[PDB]
Symmetry: D2
């Protein structure tokens, strides 16, 4: 059920800022190269492709900060306990991205294919190699795993 969200170009992973097992609400999601249980994710299916990206350790899920239905470019991604249909994402493992219900994608802030550790993540409509993500085994960061099962 658990997987790592790996920035495709850099090999860094999605983390709660601070890497806590229980991040506070509205904790920013960053990219970091470390692997540990506090950066594992799960995907709770809600409606076919749509569901919640769940931080495994805490159970909080990925939100655009503020929870708007149509967040603008550069809206920061955070973890928050609330469940609602503005926190709906799809894990596009064919095109290798993470898309929000309103159509923008998870990006590293600043759009780099080699973002340093602690780089924030934001929503943005653009499509390029720096917004690509693959979903891999916690025991083997190079083995893709099916997030939907």
């Amino acid at each position: 059920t658990t997987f790592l969200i790996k920035h495709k170009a850099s090999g860094k992973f999605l983390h709660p800022k601070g890497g806590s097992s229980n991040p506070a609400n509205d904790t920013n999601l960053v990219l970091h190269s470390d692997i540990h249980e506090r950066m594992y994710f799960q995907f709770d299916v809600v409606d076919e492709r749509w569901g919640y990206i769940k931080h495994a350790a805490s159970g909080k899920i990925v939100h655009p900060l503020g929870g708007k239905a149509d967040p603008p470019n550069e809206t920061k991604l955070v973890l928050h306990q609330d469940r609602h249909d503005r926190a709906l994402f799809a894990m596009d493992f064919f095109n290798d991205n993470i898309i929000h219900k309103a159509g923008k994608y998870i990006h590293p802030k600043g759009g780099s294919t080699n973002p340093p550790n602690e780089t924030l993540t934001v929503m943005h409509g653009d499509k390029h190699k720096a917004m690509e993500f693959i979903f891999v085994s916690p025991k083997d960061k190079d083995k893709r795993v099916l997030v939907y099962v």
Copy 2:
């Protein structure tokens, strides 16, 4: 695994075994037909992340390019066959709305029409366009997309 219909997106016709038998013979052609019934239900058996077997639910037989070659050429017919091996691996791309073979070609209606008539055969072809799009829907509601990977 979830049961679903394979619906040609532009026309609304569905993937069927030729003749619509509950136990198609090996190498029975896969065709498009407008009817819905239990003998055109499919399932998807995951083998390796995105890759798996497109399984005819009534018979247990799975989708093959005729002849089972690793890299089948354009116009290779799709058929049902009991054998399981890695040349019968497909992925159900429900984001781009197609069915892609392990070697990179897609399931097409033979002739590539967006309105193929009943009994039109299906073939492998590398082209991507409107006429090779498929969506995966509920046997109870042909307009409701369902998740085939669980």
Copy 3:
């Protein structure tokens, strides 16, 4: 200045139906494998990429039948003497297609990559291998030529 409009997948060319030096107004544009002076074309630049696709022998130009600004899918292509901005096209020699001012493309009617002789042409929004065209020398149908100079 003169070039052939070659259906990229089949090698057939754009012709006035009947192959006449002076096609009547609203004569259909068809695909035919023959080469001769009555299927030569020119391009009259009007505004950067936009211009008139001119039948060389007659001076008539390519119109969507009826001259509408936003012709629907399957609108037939014809030759007509009139000049106006609803007959504006662009010769996209990078993506290999012919695009109308309102954004649809010249297609073989029926969308075949191997259309028979006398197949009509129509406007259609779809993009695929059967709507591709390249622009070649009247003396060598495999030598691309610049239509904008």
Copy 4:
């Protein structure tokens, strides 16, 4: 025949570094917001879509530094007097980019959609909004002009 090479996302233009009427061989090509006669370009057609990107004031043309047929990502763009088929580019005014004979594109170094003045340019194969260019009138930087005539 003369035009400005405008970075589409930022509005900055291609310049010879230092802005000289006679840049020395292997002078870097940079982006800068100024307009003046020493950043005007022309395009000398050689083979259909392929030609030389000519600095109007000096007559030198755009090269990948070193003039190799298949330059790698991050090869700097410069001006050089020599004319040969490794300095062949095409001005894709449909997809809005500048492509080299071997298939890579002119990029701002660093791939920003808002590169600051003096940012160098390099070859890179990636396609995204930061490598888009449009070609405009020296008298009106928003009016696209046909570079091929």
